[PDB]
Amino acid sequence: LDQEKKIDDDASAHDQLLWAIHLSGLDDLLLFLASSSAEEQWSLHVLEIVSLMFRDQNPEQLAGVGQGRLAQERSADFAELEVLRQREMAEKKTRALQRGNRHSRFGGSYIVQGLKSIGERDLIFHKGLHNLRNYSSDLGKQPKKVPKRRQAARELSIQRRSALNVRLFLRDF
Amino acid sequence: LKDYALEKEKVKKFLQEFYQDDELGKKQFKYGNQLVRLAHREQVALYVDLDDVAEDDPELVDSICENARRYAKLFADAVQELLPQYKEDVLDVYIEHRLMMEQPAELMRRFELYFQGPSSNKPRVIREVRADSVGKLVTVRGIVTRVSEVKPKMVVATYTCDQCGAETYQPIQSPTFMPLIMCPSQECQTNRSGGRLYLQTRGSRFIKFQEMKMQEH
Numbered sequence: 001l002d003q004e005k006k007i008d009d010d011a012s013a014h015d016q017l018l019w020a021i022h023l024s025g026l027d028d029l030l031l032f033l034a035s036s037s038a039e040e041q042w043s044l045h046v047l048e049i050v051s052l053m054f055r056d057q058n059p060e061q062l063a064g065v066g067q068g069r070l071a072q073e074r075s076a077d078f079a080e081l082e083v084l085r086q087r088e089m090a091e092k093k094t095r096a097l098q099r100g101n102r103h104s105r106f107g108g109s110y111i112v113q114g115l116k117s118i119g120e121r122d123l124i125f126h127k128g129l130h131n132l133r134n135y136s137s138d139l140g141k142q143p144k145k146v147p148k149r150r151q152a153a154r155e156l157s158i159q160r161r162s163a164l165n166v167r168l169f170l171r172d173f
Numbered sequence: 174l175k176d177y178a179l180e181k182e183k184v185k186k187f188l189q190e191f192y193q194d195d196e197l198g199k200k201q202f203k204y205g206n207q208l209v210r211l212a213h214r215e216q217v218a219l220y221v222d223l224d225d226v227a228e229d230d231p232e233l234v235d236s237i238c239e240n241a242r243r244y245a246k247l248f249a250d251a252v253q254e255l256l257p258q259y260k261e262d263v264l265d266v267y268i269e270h271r272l273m274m275e276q277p278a279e280l281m282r283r284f285e286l287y288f289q290g291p292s293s294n295k296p297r298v299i300r301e302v303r304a305d306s307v308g309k310l311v312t313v314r315g316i317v318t319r320v321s322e323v324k325p326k327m328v329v330a331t332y333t334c335d336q337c338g339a340e341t342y343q344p345i346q347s348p349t350f351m352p353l354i355m356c357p358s359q360e361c362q363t364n365r366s367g368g369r370l371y372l373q374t375r376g377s378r379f380i381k382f383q384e385m386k387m388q389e390h
């Protein structure tokens with residue numbers, strides 16, 4: 001997936017392989033092997049072939065791929081881009097209002113009289129009133145380096161769809 | 174050799190006790206009057222005259238002329254130690270608040286002292302300032318070829334720590350210095366707090382500084 005770094009429904013190598021299987025008609029032979037009672041020793045192998053055919057897909061999305069899905073997904077992509085962009089703009093404005101409208105080196109320091117520092121004296125704050133408006137006592141800190149044996153597990157896959165023609169073929173299969 | 178503590182005490186004696194009959198015979202203690210003015214901050218610069226010092230200790234004048242920087246420091250320290258006896262803007266506000274915290278001597282020092290040279294010393298030309306006169310008070314004549322604009326020279330830098338709310342001070346002597354970064358106070362070091370220091374130009378002592386070049390007539 002460094003080289004197959006491919007977008008939502010661009011045909012991956014696996015998609016092209018499945019489409020080649022469809023065009024060659026070997027899917028019909030796999031169906032014959034699974035449906036026929038005469039050669040059931042190959043049923044385990046054919047199960048393995050089918051399990052390797054379906055890897056990106058999940059059944060709930062696959063069963064709903066009607067013939068008119070392409071136009072729907074065009075409009076859905078435009079809507080998703082619109083909401084993503086609006087969300088990013090909102091996040092940008094929250095960050096912009098968090099910091100001040102003066103430049104970074106515009107100095108000035110404050111004392112919060114009612115708030116003890118880690119010592120006995122009151123805390124001296126340097127990042128401006130706009131950072132004090134929503135004050136947090138970990139603004140300047142970095143995260144901790146959790147060790148390797150303590151780190152949480154992560155997802156081995158992300159849901160790129162296969163190409164729509166391949167999705168139609170897989171639904172029919 | 175010298176016992177600079179005894180020298181400081183003798184300097185205190187001179188400053189306390191000298192009088193010169195100014196204003197037609199009023200017997201004014203000139204340095205006591207100027208000490209009152211310094212203590213009240215109505216005066217900032219004190220030009221002590223070594224001709225006046227010669228009238229009760231020529232040996233002290235010789236020691237000053239031979240080791241002038243040391244005695245400049247000693248005279249300044251004696252004056253600062255004597256200002257409360259005669260104590261009848263922004264940095265003043267900061268010194269007031271630091272006194273409130275008490276309730277950095279060079280920062281709290283808000284005056285300056287200079288030696289007006291003795292008349293026995295002939296005014297040299299620039300060429301006659303030999304290497305034997307290094308560290309010694311000399312009088313030099315010349316034409317002022319060029320003068321720079323007045324610039325602020327840091328005397329005592331003042332920092333504030335973000336994590337522990339403590340002020341730290343850094344006296345400056347050399348023409349260059351290392352600005353402090355991480356907080357040295359033990360409440361930061363022992364707690365490994367990662368607290369850093371921000372220079373406070375408002376609450377740090379600057380001084381007017383000017384570079385010029387004299388030239389021979």
Ligand SMILES: [Zn+2]
Pocket residue numbers: 334335336337338339356357358360361368369
């Ligand atoms: Zn600190």
